[PDB]
């Protein structure tokens, strides 16, 4: 056996729900997706991008930031707040975000001022990597 049913969503959302050989999580801390036998866990999935391979499908990559998870015997499922997928309508208009976020990482206003913004920067460009590889899709 090498497939299971997964269901990732973020409040009224339908990113991936159906058969699934394995997904993929890429965040600062964590580098595994999901498979038929990932033990009964239920913590967070960390931010970053995500890749997957449907049992009868080819492969797709979504993208999240913060959320919890819950796997069951035969199908996993998790919930999150922001869930964007390689696309988000606009594409090159998001590249200017990493530039407007610098003015914040360059301004000092405390020990955790822009320092805490560094986590919202490296996690925002996570959706730019999966969306940049969608140029060869069409």
Is the distance from CB of 51 to CB of 86 less than 8 angstroms?
no
Each as own residue / partner, the long-range contacts of residues 84-90 (CB below 8 Å, 24 or more positions apart, any chain) are 84/127, 85/15, 85/60, 85/61, 85/130, 86/60, 86/61, 86/62, 86/127, 86/130, 86/131, 86/133, 86/134, 87/131, 87/134, 88/127, 88/131
The domains located in the chain, with CATH, are 2-89 (2.60.15.10), 90-136 (1.20.5.440)
- List gaps in the chain by the residue before each (C–N > 2.5 Å): none
């Amino acid at each position: 056996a090498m497939t299971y049913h997964l269901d990732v969503v973020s409040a009224e959302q339908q990113m991936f729900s159906g058969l699934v050989e394995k997904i993929q999580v890429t965040g600062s801390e964590g580098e595994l997706g999901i498979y038929p036998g990932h033990a009964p866990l239920l913590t967070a999935i960390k931010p970053g991008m995500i890749r997957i391979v449907k049992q009868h499908g080819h492969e797709e990559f979504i993208y999240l930031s913060g959320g919890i998870l819950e796997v069951q015997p035969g199908n996993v499922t998790v919930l999150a707040d922001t869930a964007i997928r390689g696309q988000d309508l606009d594409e090159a208009r998001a590249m200017e975000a990493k530039r407007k976020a610098e003015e914040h990482i360059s301004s000092s206003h405390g020990d955790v001022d822009y320092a805490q913004a560094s986590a919202e920067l490296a996690k925002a460009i996570a959706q730019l990597r999966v969306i940049e590889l969608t140029k060869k899709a069409m």
